[PDB]
Design a protein around this ligand. Structure first.
Ligand SMILES: CC(C)[C@H](CO)Nc1ncnc2[nH]ccc12
Ligand SMILES: [Cl-]
Length: 166
């Protein structure tokens, strides 16, 4: 595939220091994962950045999704358009530790990735969602069996995730 410059961590998990938005614009993957919340309100972090790059089209589509279907579950997901960034966007809700949500649901969140052969993804529940990114990477490695290309925007964190991995 056309993912470039990734470091191989396991048989199926790869990692790169990059903004997921810029990777999506460059690669146009079949699936980009969004770090969504249950209301699909894409205000900040990964979700706000992805939505901004779609000129708010992701938000407009999401609002119709919620009006029809209601909120997602924590640990759940839905497939929507990838707009100008990807064929599809897999919106996945990891638990928000700042809100006291069950960190065990992080494994359930990552299980959604197994429905897709290849994905470009962020670390779920980390960033503004409040969980430890080192833990999120471990759950990813131990849960996802399909091919996952992880983009991590923060360089200091990227270096810590790699250095502490084996
Ligand atoms: C999720 C968190 C560990 C990570 C820390 O850099 N955030 C992100 N990773 C990749 N692309 C991004 N775009 C906007 C934020 C962001
Ligand atoms: Cl974030």
């Amino acid at each position: 595939n056309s993912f470039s410059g990734y470091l191989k961590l396991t048989d199926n998990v790869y990692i790169k220091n990059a903004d997921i938005v810029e990777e999506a614009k460059k690669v146009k993957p079949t699936v980009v994962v969004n770090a969504a919340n249950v209301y699909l309100k894409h205000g900040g972090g990964v979700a706000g950045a992805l939505n901004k790059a779609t000129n708010n089209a992701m938000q407009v589509e999401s609002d119709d999704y919620i009006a029809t279907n209601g909120p997602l579950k924590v640990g759940g997901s839905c497939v929507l358009s990838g707009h100008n960034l990807a064929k599809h966007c897999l919106h996945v809700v990891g638990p928000n530790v700042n809100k006291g949500e069950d960190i065990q649901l992080l494994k359930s969140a990552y299980e959604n990735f197994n429905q897709h052969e290849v994905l470009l993804a962020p670390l779920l529940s980390a960033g503004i969602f409040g969980a430890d990114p080192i833990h999120s990477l471990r759950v990813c490695v131990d849960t996802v069996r399909t091919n996952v290309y992880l983009a991590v925007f923060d360089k200091n964190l990227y270096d810590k995730l790699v250095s502490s991995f084996l």
